[PDB]
Every structure is written in C-alpha cells, then in structure tokens.
Amino acid sequence: SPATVGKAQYLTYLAQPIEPSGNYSTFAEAQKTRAPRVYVGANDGMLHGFDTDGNETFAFIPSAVFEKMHQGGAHQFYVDGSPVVADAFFGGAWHTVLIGSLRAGGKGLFALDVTDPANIKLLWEIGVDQEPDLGYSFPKPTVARLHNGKWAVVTGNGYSSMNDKAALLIIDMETGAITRKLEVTGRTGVPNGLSSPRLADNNSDGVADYAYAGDLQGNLWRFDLIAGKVNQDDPFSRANDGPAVASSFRVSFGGQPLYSAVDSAGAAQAITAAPSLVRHPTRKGYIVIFGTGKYFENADARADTSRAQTLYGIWDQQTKGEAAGSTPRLTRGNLQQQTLDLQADSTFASTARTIRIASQNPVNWLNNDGSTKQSGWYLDFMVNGTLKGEMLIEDMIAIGQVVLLQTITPNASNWTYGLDPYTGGRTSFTVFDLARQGVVDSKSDYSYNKQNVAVSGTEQKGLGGLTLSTNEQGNPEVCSSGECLTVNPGP
Amino acid sequence: PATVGKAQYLTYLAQPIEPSGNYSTFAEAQKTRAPRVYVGANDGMLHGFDTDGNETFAFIPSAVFEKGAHQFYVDGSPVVADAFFGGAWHTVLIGSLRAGGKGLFALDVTDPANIKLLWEIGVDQEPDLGYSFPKPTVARLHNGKWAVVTGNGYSSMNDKAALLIIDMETGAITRKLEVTGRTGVPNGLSSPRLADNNSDGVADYAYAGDLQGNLWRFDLIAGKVNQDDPFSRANDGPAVASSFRVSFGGQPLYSAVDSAGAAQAITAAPSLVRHPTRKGYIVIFGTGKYFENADARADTSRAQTLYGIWDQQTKGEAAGSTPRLTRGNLQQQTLDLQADSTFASTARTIRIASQNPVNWLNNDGSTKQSGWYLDFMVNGTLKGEMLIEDMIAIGQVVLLQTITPNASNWTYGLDPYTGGRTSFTVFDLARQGVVDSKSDYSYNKQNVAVSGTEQKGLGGLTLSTNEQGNPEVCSSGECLTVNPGP
Lengths: 491, 486
Ligand SMILES: [Ca+2]
Ligand SMILES: [Ca+2]
Known about the structure:
The structure is a homodimer.
Chain A: E1 4-5, H1 12-15, H2 24-32, E2 37-41, E3 47-49, E4 58-60, H3 63-68, H4 73-80, E5 84-90, E6 93-101, E7 108-113, E8 121-127, E9 142-145, E10 151-156, E11 166-172, E12 178-184, E13 194-200, E14 210-215, E15 219-224, E16 250-251, E17 259-260, E18 276-279, E19 286-291, E20 310-316, E21 335-348, E22 351-358, E23 376-383, E24 397-399, E25 402-409, E26 413-419, E27 446-447, E28 452-453, E29 457-460, E30 467-471, E31 475-481, E32 483-486
The structure holds calcium ion (2 copies).
PDB class: cell adhesion
Keywords: beta propeller, pilus protein, cell adhesion
Assembly: dimeric
C-alpha cells in the first residue's frame, strides 16, 4: 500500500547533486506523466501491481514461489508486508525500483525496475545461495547512495537465518551482489537477526554516512558507512568515494551496540522497527529513537503480557565522523523515564476518540561540568503499568519537534502517538488535530487533572501503518487507515 | 480548474460561516468522493470526466435544445465550489452558455453519481444578461445566503453593465447593480472579485471591470454601518440585500485608458492586496479582451496594461465618492529586457521588470501616488500582449499570465505594492523543486529576480501545492514552484 509509484520521489535540488552524471530534472519531468501504480504484498513474496480503479496491472512470482507450485487479519497484514519503492541511480540513469521479499514463505529478496509500469523488469533475486546468512526478510530495506560510489539496498539479514546471526546486508542496486555483509556479534548461542535499518546522512548531501538497526536480541547497532581514515574538517566528504571504501564499512563502536534493550525485569526486548533520528537539542550528536516488539512468528499473533515493550531515545554523541572506537554502555538507569499515565474517552469539537496522555518529565543531559548526565529516555508501552503486550513493529516518523509512531496491541488495536523526541514525553504544544478542524488548535487538547495538555496518543481504526503527507494547503498530515490527522511538528 | 475532489475548505474556516451546518461531516464524506473533472465544452456543453479521462457525465442546457488559443478561452471552464443552502453543504458547479447563448446554470455536483440541476438562468429571467464570458464567484453574503456573483456579460440586450447577485439555491436574481458608463458605447460587466475584509467568509465588497475600462466597486454591506464593526454579521438577513449598491456614488474606482488616451477593456477579475499601510487595498487589474472573433488578432496599435490602484475606503466608510485618477497619479513600471537564458539545465526566455518605488503619502498623511501601472510591452514594442486570465495574489507577490495573439503566454510574478520587480526570487525556473538562486538572472552584472517567463501557450493560471507543501503555480503544461516572499 505505502508502495505507490507515481511522480519522482525526490526534489531535483537534492537528487541531482548526488549523481552529476545524470539528469534528475528530466527524469522527474518524465515521471510527471507516469501512470500511477500501487504495489501490494501478498501471502508469500507475490506482488500484485494495480491501483487507481483497482485494475490488476501486474503480478510477480518469485522463483521460489513459482517452483513451490510444482494468525489473524492484523498479523497476516504484517506478514504479507509491503514492498519498498524508491528512485535509484545505476546503469548510468535514474530508475524507480521496488524491493520485495519472500516474507514468511522463504528466505529471499528481489528487486524490480518499476520505472515503466508497462515494462517492469526483474533486476535480481537473492536467496541463501547468494547470501548464506539471509533469513526471512521481514525487515524493510532502505535504498540509498553510499560512499562506495553506488546505490544499494541496505537492509537487515532478517530472521531465522541458517546460523541465527545478525548482519547488515549492503546489496548493490544494479547487480544484487552482496557489496558488504556487516556481521554483528551480540549474544551468541541465542537466536538473532538484524531488523530494518535507518540510514543517516549527516552533511545533507544525499550520501548515507551511518546506518542504525536493532536486532531480535534487542541490540541497537550502528554501522559506519564511511572510510577508515577521515578528512576531519568534513569527515563525510565524498572526495574519496569509490568501490574501495566498501571494505572500510564496519560495525560502529568497535562492535559494541549503541544500546541493548531489556524490559524492567532485565529480559531482552526484540527490535523490529527501524530507528528514527533527531538532532540532539545541543546540536551535538543525535537522539536515536527505537521501539521494541516482534510480530513475525505465528506465536507473536498472541499478546505477550508478561512484560512491557518500550520506546527508547538514546543519545549518540559521536555522529560527526569521529573514530568512535567505543560508546557509553547505558541502562534504563541512565535514562529519564516517561509513562503513559491516562487513557480516556473524550470528545474534541464533535469527534469522539479514546486518547492517552503521557508524562512530561525533563531530561537532564549535562552536569554543570559539561559531563553527560542522562543519556536519553524510555517509555514502556503500557498505561499505568497495565501490560497488554502493546508493541512497536512499524517504522516511525520524526519531523520538526515531534516523533510520530504507531503501536499494535494483539487482542489487534492500533495507537498512534506524537511524542517529544527530546524527552519521550508529552509535547508542550498540541500535535494532532483531533477535532477535525483542518488545523491544530486547543480544541484537540485534553484536561488532565486541572491541566490543559496536549494529547500524546489516540486509538485509530484497523491497521494501516503510518504515512506522512501534505494535505492540499501545505499542512503536514499523518495517516494510518480511515483517518488522516493534520499534525503540528512544533513551533 | 473545475476539479471536484475533497471538500474545498478547511473546516475551521467554513464551519463559522454556517453555524446551522456541519462542514466536518461534509468534508469527511468527500474524503472518499470519486474525483471528477468538469470541462466547459463548446459554449454551453458541459462534460464530466474521471481522474482517468473517462466519459462519466455530460450536461446539455435547455439553451442548447432551444437550438486554438482563442477557442480555449471561448470554450469555457466552469466554476466549482462548496456552498451552503437547503440547510446543508453542497459542491456546486456554475456554468455559462458562453458564446453559445446568454445564460448561466448551476449543478449540484456533490454526488458524482447523482448530479442535479439547481437552476438555469436566461434573458427571460435576467433581461440584461449578456454572453456569459465573465467568471462567476460563489460566495456567502450579508443577506444571509450563498450566491453566484458575476458580471452581466457582454453584448447584452441594451449593452448595459451590471453586477448580478444570483441566489444559490433558487437562481433568483437577488440584486442587479447597474453601472453607468459611457453613452452609446457598448458595455458589460466582467468577472468580479469579492472582498472579505474581516476574514469571516462573508463577502463585503465586489470589484469588477467593464468593457469600457472602468473598474467598479460594489458595497455588499448594509447602508447603516457600525463604524466599530462595519463588517459585522449581526444584522445579516434579507433586509441587507436592498442596501447593496454601486460604491463611490456611482463613480468607478478607476477608468483604464492606454498611454494614448484610449479606453482599455477589463475582462479578467481584479485581485486585492492589503495596502502596505494597512489602510485600504491595492486593487490590481489587467487590461484586455478575447471574447470576440476580431480579438483573435493581436492589437499592436496600443499597449494593454496592468494597474495597481489604491482604494483607501475599504473599512465600511460611506465612501460616497472616490479620487479621480489617471496614469499621472501612478508610478510607472516597465519591462526593460527580454532574453533567453539557462537556469540550471533548463532553457527559458525571460523578462526583467523595473523596480521603481511607489511614494504613497506625504508627511501629514496626504496621498501622493495612488498606485502603479505596467504596460505590457518590452522597451515599448507593441505585440498586443493582454491580460484575459484571472490573477493570483499570494504573500507578497501577484502572479499573472498574459496572452499574446498571432498565441504566446507570459507568466509574471510581480510585487503587488509597486507593480515592479520583487526584491526576492519568485519562480523556480531551474526545475530545482525549490526556489533558489539558480533561477535568478544577472542584470547589468547584478543578480536580480526574474519577473516574467514565456509559457508553452495552451493553459491558464492555477495555484496548487507540491507534495512538500510549497506553493506551485501551474500553466497547463508546466508547474513552477513559487516563492510568495520572505
Ligand atoms: Ca553524507
Ligand atoms: Ca466579511
């Protein structure tokens, strides 16, 4: 669903500088008249391209699925997943690609050239034969330009791979070759798999510099996608970009994860969704936001109410290309706790909704010496300690001064949240237009114990993930399913 | 321009207009509405298509049964809008017989599956109704109802000019405000521009030009106004309709004449911009006409013009009169250069405009210059360039498109406060997706904003927003992201 192919994905001023040998403006112009298509994932790795008057246009069948031919709605919806579509440059030209996977049907990845709906081509297919550590590819891949001079599919190896290892896979966009496999150690002898990565570009040039990804073990890993040496003044320079830089890619912090997520009792919390990054308020480093949860196995269809899943905000203070041979080892104790303190039914204007209010505890980042005090925050997905097995499996959206996320609670029910990325708590401004006003105003606020407060969470209709768009008027909106909510990124 | 998708308004702006209604429920219901595009066909004929150019609907006015560039304008372009009547919100479509006959019609296009005929108006209903080339405006009035406000059109029975206020629900002529121009000279009121000066969604004034070049203003408020809240809705009701009248005691705000003293027809609707002093408004209007066959030919004998006239009595004042003005009281602006250049990798032929300041007041508040003007000509070369399309004023810029028969389209982004070059880049001529220095031009070894650029003549001016929430002006064939100003 979120995989629609209409206009060019980027703005020319951003894409063109990435590829001097190409012409994005002419590519963009061409796509202005491209026949829109929406590709949806099915049971296995099956792809059914069709939309706008829902006319079946295309259908793809993986070699693994084509040869084989020789629970619940919320859960099935997740399992079927959705392919990733993006614009990429290779073969000397811009293309619109679609990256899919065999889902739970098998261990495989595939990419299609979807630039011309009337002429979809198969770029490549990856299986265990090509990548021995490839597992069930539930992770959502990212398509990006890397410092090795080329575009690649960057994703986690997935789950239940042959040796239960976790690794970042960097697949050449054009060839499907494994440009680099960045294995992570983590805890051994215990099943692991790397999840959806979030690429970081810290000098706004369209070339990915770092990648962040959690794993089934709850480790939040960072990977350096830049050369060993540096240029110090501008460590993210493209000057030495080339195929050789690929060998320099490495797990960051000497192989130590930025963080290892465990619940209140100390039990590991799997991370499925991609992290989100927000520049730290001091402008030094970034706050890495990630939530825990897992939903790929049948057993996961049922709520695990033995522990709470959690949303974390961890300070990565070494994001300026420093060697970063290591990183602080943190625990919830080094973070500021936030809580979901109230769930209630209320009416905003005329619209009735069930909402949740979060705490608003400040985070004390530095002591007067300048040394680090709290390194972040956390929020257990539970209202006043009641465990319902609420978890995060969908990617989040960080914009302005807010982080938007959607959680799922297997019964499943969906809760959309708008939180302060700097604290993990309630924003000081109202985020959602819950009153269907067309704008974000006080009509959407809630009276929490004599206090007019911003609503941090609201329950929304059947699963649909979260998408950020702009309603005709320049106003940003966040949509899930059935409802889109005008949002306020902050003053 | 006549596309019917989601609700036209943001709820917080529409709801206050009709407390007895629920725009929220209306808007929600349209979120799922099947998008339709309505194209005004051969004068009268109206065809509806789906997002995928598919014959979905077609309307043939009783008039019909009663039995390249020039054709684009003469053909049509219906007006769609959300209006309130019958105690509910509806999406209406106002059509005109155009060159076919003399009449207007309104359709209820709220439900693409069940379109209804609201009403049809002809000379039988409105004797002074002429060929309906003027573009109507759907608006809420102080008489308590929504109405179709438009110019009576051209070559009407007695060639008179009048503002027509047509009840939205009934199609009845609520008021006909006749205007007195020059004797024996054929006249007709053109597309009006309604003004809402206290931003509550209820029109207060209407401005419209006529074939004689007069720019008229009409008071759409009660005669007995409360100086503390002249635009108040407290006394709204049918009793207010009788007080609607021609402003300034029957005198036009301005009478447009070319540099040689000849009258300049006004066909396009004016555009309003609050005066920098916050007192009054700058009434911007362009000159030209293209509804008659002879108009297909370029008139190279004179230069058409764009004017910015200061109306200093826009706060409910009785305004029994208005200053008699001429080019002499206005600051001139000129198009000093036209050249072909390349912005980024996109080739474009552009024009540079002067940037002469406007001196509005004396130390004691006395009025010096009452506006500005710009003759559509480069270095005095007359090509017959004229404005026949509505303009778009947003932020600190007025966007307009002129047509040069022979036809060639020129899109301009000018400073509304002076009619000259903006001090900032307006158009993204480099196809960067954003407006940056790549779109500026070196004028006399100085970076300066480009005020005009030639378009692939075939469309009009439409303002929209890109996926990134930024202003974008499209000209059928190409959209240019724009910068409304700092
Ligand atoms: Ca970079
Ligand atoms: Ca008003």
